[PDB]
Amino acid sequence: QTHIKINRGELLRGIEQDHTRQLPDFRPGDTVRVDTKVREGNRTRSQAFEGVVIAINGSGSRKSFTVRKISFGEGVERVFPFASPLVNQVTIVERGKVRRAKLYYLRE
């Protein structure tokens, strides 16, 4: 409703990148998420999440991904922003053969 000639694609993308981060390529399969954590006070305790990746959602700074683990008898899911300063790298446990980009059936 203001008429300026401008591309919102490049405008927006302008700061996406500085906040965007590239991860090892995984469509399927298990992954170790090594996550740096200061919520313990001064202490920073690296934590492990080793899950199946069930979701690929987003792109740009918003691109995120989802893993699912069972820790101590009960199921857990977690969603990591590909650039989350609270995150150090992710690596592949193994490569999965999967038929759809979703994998929600894993909950049943």
Partner: protein
């Protein structure tokens, strides 16, 4: 997000299997005891929130039997829980720790992962009984 009428699990050995909610409250732990919750509404119980609840099904032989009305702290919400880096956690089943009025748990240990937000909320011994703080 728990409401009255909403059955949660028990993360302790307190002797109670399933409890049903009765009242969400505003849960003041600090100073000397727990404090008295600001507001008589507060419609939903999140993680690190205290509820009051009826004990619905409990095992034989416990510090807590069926029908015991008791306060509990909320350990695992299915309803998603967002952190300030932006990640989110959510567990498959709902669950909780039965406590006393000074906040300490009534069970001798705690079962399965608990939300890190519980340590945000200063529930120490519960975080200490925790197999994993996620």
């Amino acid at each position: 997000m728990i409401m009255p009428q909403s059955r949660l699990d028990v993360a302790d050995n307190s002797g109670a299997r399933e409890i049903m909610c009765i009242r969400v409250l505003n849960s003041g732990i600090g100073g000397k005891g727990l404090t008295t919750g600001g507001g008589g509404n507060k419609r939903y119980a999140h993680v690190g929130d205290i509820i009051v609840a009826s004990v619905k099904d409990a095992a034989p032989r416990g510090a807590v039997k069926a029908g015991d009305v008791v306060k509990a702290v909320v350990v695992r919400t299915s309803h998603a829980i967002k952190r300030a880096d932006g990640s989110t956690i959510r567990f498959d089943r709902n669950a909780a720790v039965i406590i006393n009025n000074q906040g300490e748990p009534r069970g001798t240990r705690v079962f399965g992962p608990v939300a890190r937000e519980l340590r945000d909320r200063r529930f120490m011994k519960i975080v200490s009984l925790a197999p994993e703080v996620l």
